[PDB]
Design a protein around this ligand. Structure first.
Ligand SMILES: CCCCCCCC(=O)OC[C@H](COP(=O)(O)O[C@@H]1[C@H](O)[C@H](OP(=O)(O)O)[C@@H](O)[C@H](OP(=O)(O)O)[C@H]1O)OC(=O)CCCCCCC
Ligand SMILES: CCCCCCCC(=O)OC[C@H](COP(=O)(O)O[C@@H]1[C@H](O)[C@H](OP(=O)(O)O)[C@@H](O)[C@H](OP(=O)(O)O)[C@H]1O)OC(=O)CCCCCCC
Lengths: 621, 621
């Protein structure tokens, strides 16, 4: 009856879930399995992965606008303030796509599963309180600067991906073991300020208690390492032993225990979670076996239906072709459950595909050429001339600088460059014969090479059309692309190839743990906008201050300058100066914001991002 | 005959070599085994370990002398130049102790073993060329500044210790696998200077090729991270993406691959060498079995001689007592070789020793007290009052600063401090009754506590004798010791105890890999003296230069200021300024010295020192 195909559609959903590591917890009906295949297709999810990009992009356009060519305070125009209809209009279109998504994700699962899963409760309460905020931002007037719904926008990014859920749970089970050091770092920082204030009371860095605390917090990351030593080391030579002992205990040892203790528990709890992701793979092969053995209602499956199921599944070609021969390889056997999971080990075989070389209408001139050009020396001799073009730019660049920069001689550089553009033209025209245009475009290193020979050919005739011999600007862009062209020797050489190829593999694991950085920037910038928006005005400074250096571009006026001021605080150089500005301009209690940013960004996250990659880099050798 | 005791003295030397991991490769005679026990005793080797400290200490006294209270150039006196007899006289006494050491180490081993061992050849040629240099430094006159024998002085430190030999071999088998990145870091640094010079040619950091190279080398370690961005980011907002991409590739990723690749091969080759050190331990038990089984000339040993051999060996008490009962535990058994190495597994048992509490002549008042004081709460309530004394200093220190620092009120702090000195007096006088003076001095935490109660008692009556109520200076040293006293809560608390106790265990492994830092400082300081000795003279500066900041104390005039200028270069903050000074003062070719110092100190050594400790810290949990 109708139980034949219903067992089949119960089997296609399980084996496709067995590929992409999703939990087998559904409300399996006839109609829902039509809905399930459409939601996890690459046409519906590529709009959900597109609209999350749009709402985070909407911070570039809102009323503290960032569409200005500069970012100074001394000279910048007014940014184009948009009319306040179109700002909030594109928000509500991108919220009525998540209003469909929560209803689909909730209908496909049980209501009992809904009440136990705390993400979907959090996906609910965030969606409602944003919808109340969209009313009140329209209802009174479009003049409220404080937009609370802008803070909740990274929650839609964390809800989508299934690995940023895992590593956020993973950080929570490592911070309780941090407290044996975070207490130990506090007593070390608190004893040295009282011991520091008594020694130099018989320099202006220690004439106060909150200054001497904030001057040893800066020394803890060595951001002012000679400057805090000088007026006490010049007085007596033995006072340098106070600051030598402090940086050895605190900066070199205690700050590095905070890295190693957090990571060694981060490695333990993560591998337990990634072990769970492998468990759902073997359950999908297991759950497919139960319904297909129930098609009879020995202990096995009839191979006649097994042609039909792997025909319908979404896969590659050779992954489908090897499976379709092996199900044809048997007759009337009853494929057991261990034999069923003997079958699906094919999915971990990396495959290679290449196109055949092209012949011509003639024999003898054809065969003599591809014996030479395919020997991987023709793109080795092309590497040497790429170095020959690069040194001529360097020879040009060290003789003009001894003269005024008005470029007395440009003709010599032009008549050597145009020869090399003819040379780069011959590499494209010859190799397309040696491999065929479908084969020459198949290798991705030649796509990077073949594209740049086109743009150099376009630009060289362009400057020769106007100037038969902006002309300094036109020959400037020509030489920049040649230095960009020199990157081709990185995949070509033998030792540089494997270090490039492994990092290209780790981009499929950078997608998860790099996505948290977008969450941490987005929270601190909007809070950073709503605290220091217009607190810097520019209307003879001391030589070390925020004003003597021309640091006016590191404001917090708009979302594009907030993501650069927060960048120069992640690298921890010279952040004694921002604590001098944003204390003198916006009160002494602003230092809790920057100290919290130094704890989240440059201590916890950056080390745990690089330890996660550079372990997985060397593990893959 | 005389073969009885000769087999015995052949057995004492092997089992003592089985304890301290020395190779069983000797010229075993009758007379040499008298010499061998004296050379590896703790009375001869504690002079060899003392005279190596002396020659490195002699750099503090030689003719660029470092006996000056300050280290400026603006104001310092002439250092006391010693008469040139006594400088070179103490050197030759410390060279005629190594002239005995090479002859003893060579006579005890074979001449065939001498020719194959390259350390003893290096110990020879260094010893001779220093002896020629001691003549020529005396023979013409004591006026040659260049002392080549001062460079060779760390070789006597590397020759003595048997683990700095191992890790120096270990670094050599990791640098060949560095070259896949050191080439990759060079092309990345060389492409960005030509691409950088063309973009800003349509700021003064890029108007030259050697300046733009040395300005991106500084950016590679983020020592000038906002300062190099400013004049191009204020011009146009999109130019910040040039410096964001550069620090992500180079500073955060490529500089960290240089740490992880070197360490992951440093971990591999070191554990192979430490495995070899365990191999000599089981050979010493094996080589002792062969001679004692040859005392018969079943398959075993007679236990009658085995009382005599472990009686003569140098060991501890319980390590000797447990062995002396087990050899007495058997009768006429023939102890086999596996039974012989069944015996010597006792040497890996950490032992505890404690002294009994002391009673008095009376029963009832005695028993009521030690039920209370030994409950580890009496030194918990002592921790709270130590926090109560510390907060009163903090309450004092935040109210004087709002006034002028002439200390209007000191009487209030004095009449609370003297109460706490009586309180700290009662902790010593009561606990010495509760445990006995031999037991109270047995625990090392009470030695640190009991000593500071004496010095506070000495100082408190001292300021009260002169001043019945320098007096600000006398009450200053009193409050400093109280903050020093607060360190006692670190071993007392539960979570802080295990993090303190493990690092105290790692000092017996810090002795090896920390000794290389003394070699790297000693080479670069003497070279640093002989290149920039008197090249800084002080006779309105730009606001960012070496002269506006008062950096005059970071000279290279003497060996004590060289070890501080090299310290502020190991921490890599503000070393753009030294490259501005020591290029403008001593030629542009001095930058090879500082760049080589940044490669050896703050890239290779510091990371490999901390990765070696903080792995072994967390491995011991
Ligand atoms: C904003 C108003 C309230 C909203 C707050 C929302 C907070 C919230 O619901 O999370 C609950 C879940 C727990 O619930 P839980 O369900 O366990 O969280 C994960 C998801 O279920 C995930 O399901 P998939 O999406 O299908 O992958 C599963 O794979 C993971 O298991 P695994 O580890 O074996 O891989 C779970 O760890 O995770 C937390 O425990 C939060 C800890 C956050 C750490 C903070 C770091 C500072
Ligand atoms: C100055 C004029 C010339 C003098 C130069 C002297 C250079 C020199 O003789 O060393 C030879 C030995 C090789 O000879 P080698 O004997 O193998 O060096 C070690 C010692 O014998 C050591 O003997 P003990 O003292 O009894 O402990 C032994 O334990 C180690 O084995 P192990 O690894 O299994 O623990 C050996 O690695 O070690 C080098 O291979 C030098 C590499 C230096 C790396 C430089 C780093 C940049």
């Amino acid at each position: 009856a109708a139980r034949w195909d219903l067992c089949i559609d119960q089997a296609v959903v399980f084996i496709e879930d067995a590929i992409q590591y999703r939990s087998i917890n559904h409300r399996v009906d006839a109609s829902s399995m039509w809905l399930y295949r459409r939601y996890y297709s690459n046409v519906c999810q590529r709009t959900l992965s597109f609209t999350i990009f749009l709402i985070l992009f909407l911070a570039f356009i809102e009323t503290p606008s960032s569409l200005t060519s500069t970012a100074d305070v001394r000279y910048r125009a007014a940014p184009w303030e948009p009319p306040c209809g179109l700002t909030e209009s594109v928000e509500v279109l991108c919220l009525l796509v998540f209003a469909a998504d929560l209803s689909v994700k909730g209908y496909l699962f049980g209501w009992a599963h809904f009440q136990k899963n705390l993400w979907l409760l959090g996906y609910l309460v965030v969606l409602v309180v944003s919808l109340v905020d969209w009313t009140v931002s329209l209802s009174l007037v479009c003049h409220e600067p404080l937009r609370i719904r802008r803070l909740l926008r990274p929650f839609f990014l964390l809800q989508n991906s299934s690995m940023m859920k895992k590593t956020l749970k993973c950080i929570r089970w490592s911070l309780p073991e941090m407290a044996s050091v975070g207490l130990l770092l506090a007593i070390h920082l608190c004893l040295f300020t009282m011991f520091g204030m008594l020694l130099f009371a018989g320099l202006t860095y220690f004439q106060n208690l909150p200054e001497s605390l904030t001057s040893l917090l800066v020394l803890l990351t060595t951001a002012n390492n000679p400057d805090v030593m000088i007026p006490a080391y010049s007085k007596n030579r033995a006072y340098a032993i106070f600051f030598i002992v402090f940086t050895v205990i605190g900066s070199l040892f205690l700050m590095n225990l905070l890295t190693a203790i957090i990571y060694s528990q981060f490695r333990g709890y993560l591998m337990k979670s990634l072990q769970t992701s492998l468990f759902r793979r073997r359950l999908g092969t297991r759950a497919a076996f139960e319904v297909l053995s129930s098609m009879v209602g020995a202990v096995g499956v009839k191979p006649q239906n097994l042609l039909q199921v792997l025909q319908k599944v979404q896969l590659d070609s050779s992954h489908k072709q090897a499976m379709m021969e092996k199900v044809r390889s048997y007759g009337s056997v009853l494929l057991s459950a261990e034999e069923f999971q003997k079958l699906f080990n094919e999915l971990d075989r990396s495959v290679v595909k290449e196109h055949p070389p092209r012949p011509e209408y003639q024999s003898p001139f054809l065969q003599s050429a591809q014996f030479l050009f395919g020997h991987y020396y023709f793109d080795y001799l092309g590497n040497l001339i790429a170095l020959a073009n690069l040194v001529s730019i360097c020879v040009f660049l060290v003789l003009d600088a001894d003269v005024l920069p008005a470029e007395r001689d440009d003709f010599i550089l032009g008549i050597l460059n145009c020869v090399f553009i003819v040379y780069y033209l011959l590499e494209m025209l010859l190799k397309v014969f040696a491999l065929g245009l479908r084969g020459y475009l198949s290798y991705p290193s030649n796509v990077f090479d073949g594209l740049l020979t086109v743009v150099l050919l376009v630009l060289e005739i362009s400057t020769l059309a106007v100037y038969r011999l902006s002309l300094w600007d036109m020959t400037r862009m020509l030489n920049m692309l040649i230095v960009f062209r020199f990157l081709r020797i990185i995949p070509s050489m033998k030792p540089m190839a494997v270090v490039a190829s492994t990092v290209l593999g780790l981009v499929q694991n950078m997608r998860a743990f790099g996505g948290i950085l977008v969450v941490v920037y987005y929270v601190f910038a909007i809070i950073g906008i709503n605290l220091f928006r217009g607190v810097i005005v520019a209307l003879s400074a001391p030589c070390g201050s925020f004003e003597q250096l021309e640091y006016w571009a590191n404001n917090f006026d708009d979302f594009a300058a907030a993501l650069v001021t927060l960048w120069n605080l992640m690298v921890v150089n010279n952040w004694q100066v921002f604590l001098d500005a944003y204390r003198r301009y916006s009160g002494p209690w602003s230092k809790i914001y920057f100290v919290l940013w130094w704890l989240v960004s440059s201590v916890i996250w950056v080390n745990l991002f690089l330890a996660l990659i550079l372990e997985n880099f060397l593990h893959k050798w």
